[PDB]
Design a protein around this nucleic acid. Structure first.
Ligand SMILES: [K+]
Ligand SMILES: [K+]
Ligand SMILES: [K+]
Ligand SMILES: [K+]
Ligand SMILES: [K+]
Ligand SMILES: [K+]
Ligand SMILES: [K+]
Ligand SMILES: [K+]
Ligand SMILES: [K+]
Ligand SMILES: [K+]
Ligand SMILES: [K+]
Ligand SMILES: [K+]
Ligand SMILES: [K+]
Ligand SMILES: [K+]
Ligand SMILES: [K+]
Ligand SMILES: [K+]
Ligand SMILES: [K+]
Ligand SMILES: [K+]
Ligand SMILES: [K+]
Ligand SMILES: [K+]
Ligand SMILES: [K+]
Ligand SMILES: [Mg+2]
Ligand SMILES: [Mg+2]
Ligand SMILES: [Mg+2]
Ligand SMILES: [Mg+2]
Ligand SMILES: [Mg+2]
Ligand SMILES: [Mg+2]
Ligand SMILES: [Mg+2]
Ligand SMILES: [Mg+2]
Ligand SMILES: [Mg+2]
Ligand SMILES: [Mg+2]
Ligand SMILES: [Mg+2]
Ligand SMILES: [Mg+2]
Ligand SMILES: [Mg+2]
Ligand SMILES: [Mg+2]
Ligand SMILES: [Mg+2]
Ligand SMILES: [Mg+2]
Ligand SMILES: [Mg+2]
Ligand SMILES: [Mg+2]
Ligand SMILES: [Mg+2]
Ligand SMILES: [Mg+2]
Ligand SMILES: [Mg+2]
Ligand SMILES: [Mg+2]
Ligand SMILES: [Mg+2]
Ligand SMILES: [Mg+2]
Ligand SMILES: [Mg+2]
Ligand SMILES: [Mg+2]
Ligand SMILES: [Mg+2]
Ligand SMILES: [Mg+2]
Ligand SMILES: [Mg+2]
Ligand SMILES: [Mg+2]
Ligand SMILES: [Mg+2]
Ligand SMILES: [Mg+2]
Ligand SMILES: [Mg+2]
Ligand SMILES: [Mg+2]
Ligand SMILES: [Mg+2]
Ligand SMILES: [Mg+2]
Ligand SMILES: [Mg+2]
Ligand SMILES: [Mg+2]
Ligand SMILES: [Mg+2]
Ligand SMILES: [Mg+2]
Ligand SMILES: [Mg+2]
Ligand SMILES: [Mg+2]
Ligand SMILES: [Mg+2]
Ligand SMILES: [Mg+2]
Ligand SMILES: [Mg+2]
Ligand SMILES: [Mg+2]
Ligand SMILES: [Mg+2]
Ligand SMILES: [Mg+2]
Ligand SMILES: [Mg+2]
Ligand SMILES: [Mg+2]
Ligand SMILES: [Mg+2]
Ligand SMILES: [Mg+2]
Ligand SMILES: [Mg+2]
Ligand SMILES: [Mg+2]
Ligand SMILES: [Mg+2]
Ligand SMILES: [Mg+2]
Ligand SMILES: [Mg+2]
Ligand SMILES: [Mg+2]
Ligand SMILES: [Mg+2]
Ligand SMILES: [Mg+2]
Ligand SMILES: [Mg+2]
Ligand SMILES: [Mg+2]
Ligand SMILES: [Mg+2]
Ligand SMILES: [Mg+2]
Ligand SMILES: [Mg+2]
Ligand SMILES: [Mg+2]
Ligand SMILES: [Mg+2]
Ligand SMILES: [Mg+2]
Ligand SMILES: [Mg+2]
Ligand SMILES: [Mg+2]
Ligand SMILES: [Mg+2]
Ligand SMILES: [Mg+2]
Ligand SMILES: [Mg+2]
Ligand SMILES: [Mg+2]
Ligand SMILES: [Mg+2]
Ligand SMILES: [Mg+2]
Lengths: 85, 9, 49, 65
RNA sequence: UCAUAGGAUAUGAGAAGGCAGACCCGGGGAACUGAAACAUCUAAGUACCCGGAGGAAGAGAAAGCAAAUGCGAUUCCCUGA
RNA sequence: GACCGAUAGUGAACCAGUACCGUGAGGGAAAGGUGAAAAGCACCCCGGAAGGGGAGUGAAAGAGAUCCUGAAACCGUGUGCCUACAAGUAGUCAGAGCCCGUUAACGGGUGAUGGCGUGCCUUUUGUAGAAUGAACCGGCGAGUUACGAUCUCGUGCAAGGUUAAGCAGAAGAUGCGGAGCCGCAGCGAAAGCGAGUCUGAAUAGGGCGCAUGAGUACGUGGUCGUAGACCCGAAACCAGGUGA
RNA sequence: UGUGGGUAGGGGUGAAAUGCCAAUCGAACCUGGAGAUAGCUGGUUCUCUCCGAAAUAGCUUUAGGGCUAGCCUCAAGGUAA
RNA sequence: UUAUCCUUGGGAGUCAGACUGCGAGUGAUAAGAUCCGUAGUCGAAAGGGAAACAGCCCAGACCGCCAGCUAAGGUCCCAAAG
RNA sequence: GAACAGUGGUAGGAGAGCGUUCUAAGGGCUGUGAAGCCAGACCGGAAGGACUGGUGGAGCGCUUAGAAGUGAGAAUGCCGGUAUGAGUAGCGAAAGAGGGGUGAGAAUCCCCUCCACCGAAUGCCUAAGGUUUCCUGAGGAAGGCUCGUCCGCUCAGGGUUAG
RNA sequence: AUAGGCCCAGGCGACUGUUUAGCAAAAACACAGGUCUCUGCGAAGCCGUAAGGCGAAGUAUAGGGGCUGACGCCUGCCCGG
RNA sequence: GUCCUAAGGUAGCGAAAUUCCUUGUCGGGUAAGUUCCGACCCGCACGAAAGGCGCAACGAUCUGGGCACUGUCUCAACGAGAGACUCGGUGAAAUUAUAGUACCUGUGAAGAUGCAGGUUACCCGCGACAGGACGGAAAGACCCCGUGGAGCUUUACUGCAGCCUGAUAUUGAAUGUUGGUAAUUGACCUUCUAACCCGCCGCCCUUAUCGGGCGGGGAGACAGUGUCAGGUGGGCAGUUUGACUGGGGCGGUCGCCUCCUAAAAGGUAACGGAGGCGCCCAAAGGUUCCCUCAGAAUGGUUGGAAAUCAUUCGCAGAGUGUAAAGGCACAAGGGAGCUUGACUGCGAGACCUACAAGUCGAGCAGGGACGAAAGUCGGGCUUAGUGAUCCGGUGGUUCCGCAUG
């Protein structure tokens, strides 16, 4: 039984998935430090009491409630507001 | 008794 | 054995050394001295006895 | 016969007060040019053996006080 | 040449060989196996062969142990671990 | 002797390292039971004998040597029910007829005919499987024990718990034996400090601890480790021998 | 072709086929190391009850093996998360 | 409304999956093909239906009954019911 | 005891039990019949347990606890027995026939007659090897591929002589 | 009864021999012949740890090893590896 | 002619025991010839002692063709004997889950005596035949797999024997000669004899081709042997020689980053589709301050399609060290000044995750850079640019240091 020779692919590579995106929900309580969003670039901007890390990670600078919110016409931010106290 | 056998090479 | 994955102990570094001249003391807290009588001369030999 | 201690493990782990196993970190031998100061600062500190690993190895350190 | 080698004779409850399928002290000494392969390493100075025993053998009366107010031949058991 | 009881226990309960196998080194079986006592069946009969049937002996001879018991497979004789128009993993549920009569039960045997229904095991995504294993019956035949570890449960004692060797003592219990072991304190690579300690310049922060207290000895059980380690099975490797 | 002999296994012997060396030969036979090792195949014996998977991820000289995680179970807690 | 969920500890097994529907790749928009995603069933699930038929449709067997109602699928005869 | 709910299951986890041998302590049974074995229409949710009769002819239950060589249907498992195939394949190169005899019995043993086969052997001698198989008398269970009065077989005796 | 079939032509091996006991008898092996090469004798080569041996009671016209394979005609080029 | 080589295959033979294409082509033989013989030569891939080409004789050799001959065949017939068959005697075996064991079409682990629907079939044998029971026999030799063996190879690895070579011991005496050291020690050559050697001769032990002794002779501090050392060394030994894979081999791949597949969280496979990485930058880093890009049109010396200049239009059609994606014009793009935070100690809390690792981080302290200050700064718009442990090196060190220092 004859078997035709076959070629090869020059593809077959991919990097590890980086588990990007939202890490806390709108309206969820977070502690200071909590990563809110992982991203390349600013898909979402740091709002009130939120920071942008060296790799564009958005994180809560205080304890409080996460609010994702429209930032002008085209953009989005995420903010953390203190609880009513 | 065969040289090779059943379903030989 | 982890089926050929480098075992955890081999992945991690050896640390430190053992002192030949290490001294371990029999420790006694104050609560244990409270069990003796008043004005007692508490000594190692008495504690041990 | 008595169980023999695993001597490699005994040279690398230590039992804590609550019966956890203290360990050092990997990646602390060489190639420090390729690791950030943050990494190097963190790998310097001790760590604990994980739950999954502890169940695998606890009997190998049974004799250690 | 002396002599020696060699030869002859006499005397010897002199040796020889066996045997415990054991234990003991020596000479020689594997490999499978484990290491998830393998060579250092392991198995193991084991099995086996050889020599020598003795009722036991071997060791033994400090060119020792230690680091005390020290101990006081060796062997073996417990422990150290 | 909380060892074996004739496939066990020695290979060997017996004339066994025999018989038998192999040139040899070497391998290596099977095979126990009359009865309390031989009282081991005088005599008669069929038969050449074997073997029987009587008669005797004996508690028993259907204990007569192939001799305690005497299962199953397997082989027969007799016969209650069924069976020569039927398509069958063989049963099961329904069911007349015929034959019986019990641990007396809404009983037993047989079964015309009707419905349903592709063994068991192993291994598989999936096996009625046209995959594997078993002729049948019987016997034998596979997670054990020791010493350590750990957890649960139990018991004793409890910030303590416990002895080993040894000595005495039934090969015993037990008494003695505190050397040793674990625990009551941790942290640190270590010196060391100590309810703290390490890192650090730090009265910072952080790690591990304390505060937030239970262990230890023994036993049963589960699991692990070292041992052949649940049982059976290679091809091979090495050592010392036996063979032209 | 007879008789008597010689060579022995990490070895003999070979007018060479890896042939032959006691019906055994790419390394004889016997015993022992030895219950070698076997991530492989087969097998693993009474009953009922409660609960009840997986056939995935990661890493692996790994791919029909293993380890940790996932999913099962038993206990004790927390408790209502 | 429901009764799970978490922690710690003891004990596992599993790491060959199958088909079906739906969303993709590979293939020839072949395969009872292969490889993912997602739901189901089988696996480890007997019963009824689909003639027979692991994976489809209906549906989850603690036992007994010569009671009743239904599901899918059916109701001329085989074969229960027009 | 009520109610309510639940009770398919492989790997596997957990629980509760059945039975086997042995031991200890109670308590018993048994020659007026133990265990084992055979039979039955009995009992328990299962493992299993009784009762009755027969055989058997001397040992054995029960309770509680302990300890295990503790349960078999599968291993092309080991050993033994016995089937199936089956009254089947086979009965191993070859010339016998008849008469007589012996005998419980005769194709098969003995005798006779003719016939047939070997004859550089299928004859005579003798190695090695075997070891009594040799001779005589008696025998017929097994051996002999049938039979058997026969035999290389069984039992008794006997038999091998060297300057 | 017993007692060559023969011929024409080609491949391979010159020939008689030998071989896979038990699936191969051959074109394979051997062979006489060729050639290369080693060996001055306690030879070289070979067996053996060694002693001791074979070689050989031989001595280069001899001995060992490699390749070729009667005979005939022949056997070119390359010493970089 | 040119390139290359150590040299480019001579003689002879050639579709061959060698020729894939191939039944090459032509001729012969036959009615017809993929075979055979003779020629030819595009020799896939003959070729000169792993000999080339011939070759009488020889062959249980292989090949092609003839004569003779025939049951080889057309095409089979009859006969003899041995079995088979019947009777009497004797009496195995392999196999075997239990079987009351039809056929067709279908179904099903995809090829059914046994399942479904039909069709057919009274019960029991005997002689025959082999279609099926995936018949029996032998745990498939092929193939794959096992981190299973064994035999064999070598420029696989590591060893060992053997062999060669040196030092040193056994091992001494002279002589010159030539190196450090003006008189002392090494190296070298030659000579000696007395160790050692003799598989030389005579004598003796002694009836002895062993051995020993004695005396000659030869050789000689060499050889041999011991210890140590280097070289050589498939002669021999132990072993290794990956995995994935639409079977294996061969090809390709193996870690990291980006995108798509990926089903609008995250994750998600294939030897699916595309690309990158194993760095670079002393500024291309930090900060303060200032800024705006591509391209086009029009004008203008050299000067063009396009150099520099000017105007106008100009969400970016540019740039962002580098792949891609996500971002970026209050720039993250461009320019300039000053700098070294491309800091040390850390770190609430998070993400990711089997583990090992990986990521983000406000904030605190120390001491700084830039800034008037606010403040920013623990490298770079973000996401690759990397590798555990063991072992070893280097620097530091209020640590240990086997009686004590
Ligand atoms: K070894
Ligand atoms: K026996
Ligand atoms: K029926
Ligand atoms: K098969
Ligand atoms: K602290
Ligand atoms: K307790
Ligand atoms: K235990
Ligand atoms: K075990
Ligand atoms: K040989
Ligand atoms: K699917
Ligand atoms: K009875
Ligand atoms: K069996
Ligand atoms: K003749
Ligand atoms: K007779
Ligand atoms: K040959
Ligand atoms: K022809
Ligand atoms: K010829
Ligand atoms: K099948
Ligand atoms: K047939
Ligand atoms: K395929
Ligand atoms: K700057
Ligand atoms: Mg084909
Ligand atoms: Mg960065
Ligand atoms: Mg370091
Ligand atoms: Mg190994
Ligand atoms: Mg003595
Ligand atoms: Mg008996
Ligand atoms: Mg016995
Ligand atoms: Mg004999
Ligand atoms: Mg009786
Ligand atoms: Mg009796
Ligand atoms: Mg009897
Ligand atoms: Mg009819
Ligand atoms: Mg009828
Ligand atoms: Mg039918
Ligand atoms: Mg399959
Ligand atoms: Mg199988
Ligand atoms: Mg079978
Ligand atoms: Mg070997
Ligand atoms: Mg011999
Ligand atoms: Mg001989
Ligand atoms: Mg032979
Ligand atoms: Mg061993
Ligand atoms: Mg359930
Ligand atoms: Mg495997
Ligand atoms: Mg797990
Ligand atoms: Mg799948
Ligand atoms: Mg499929
Ligand atoms: Mg399964
Ligand atoms: Mg289910
Ligand atoms: Mg079902
Ligand atoms: Mg049906
Ligand atoms: Mg099934
Ligand atoms: Mg009807
Ligand atoms: Mg149910
Ligand atoms: Mg009994
Ligand atoms: Mg048993
Ligand atoms: Mg059986
Ligand atoms: Mg008959
Ligand atoms: Mg007959
Ligand atoms: Mg027959
Ligand atoms: Mg017949
Ligand atoms: Mg016959
Ligand atoms: Mg005959
Ligand atoms: Mg006679
Ligand atoms: Mg007879
Ligand atoms: Mg010839
Ligand atoms: Mg010849
Ligand atoms: Mg042959
Ligand atoms: Mg021959
Ligand atoms: Mg032949
Ligand atoms: Mg010599
Ligand atoms: Mg000689
Ligand atoms: Mg030749
Ligand atoms: Mg030739
Ligand atoms: Mg030449
Ligand atoms: Mg032609
Ligand atoms: Mg013709
Ligand atoms: Mg050639
Ligand atoms: Mg040549
Ligand atoms: Mg089916
Ligand atoms: Mg089908
Ligand atoms: Mg069919
Ligand atoms: Mg069948
Ligand atoms: Mg077959
Ligand atoms: Mg069959
Ligand atoms: Mg097989
Ligand atoms: Mg073969
Ligand atoms: Mg080799
Ligand atoms: Mg080995
Ligand atoms: Mg592979
Ligand atoms: Mg392939
Ligand atoms: Mg490759
Ligand atoms: Mg989605
Ligand atoms: Mg997504
Ligand atoms: Mg290492
Ligand atoms: Mg010191």
């Amino acid at each position: 039984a004859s078997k035709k020779g076959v070629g090869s692919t020059k593809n077959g590579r991919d990097s590890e998935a980086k588990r990007l995106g939202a890490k806390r929900a709108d309206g969820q309580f977070v502690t200071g430090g909590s990563i809110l969003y992982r991203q390349r670039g600013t898909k979402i901007y740091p709002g009130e009491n939120v920071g942008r890390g060296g790799d564009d990670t958005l994180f809560a600078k205080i304890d409080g409630t996460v609010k994702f919110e429209r930032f002008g016409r085209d953009r989005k931010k995420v903010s953390v507001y203190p609880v009513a106290q | 008794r065969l040289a090779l056998g059943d379903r030989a090479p | 054995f982890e089926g050929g994955q480098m075992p955890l102990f081999q992945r991690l570094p050896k640390r430190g050394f053992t002192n030949i001249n290490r001294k371990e003391y029999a420790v006694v807290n104050l609560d244990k001295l409270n069990g003796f009588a008043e004005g007692t001369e508490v000594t190692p030999e008495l504690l041990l006895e | 016969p008595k169980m023999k201690t695993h001597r490699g493990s005994a040279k690398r782990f230590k039992k804590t007060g609550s019966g956890k196993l203290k360990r050092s970190h990997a990646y602390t031998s060489h190639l420090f040019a390729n690791k950030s100061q943050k990494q190097k600062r963190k790998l310097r500190k001790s760590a604990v053996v994980s739950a999954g690993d502890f169940k695998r190895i606890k009997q190998m350190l049974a004799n250690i006080k």
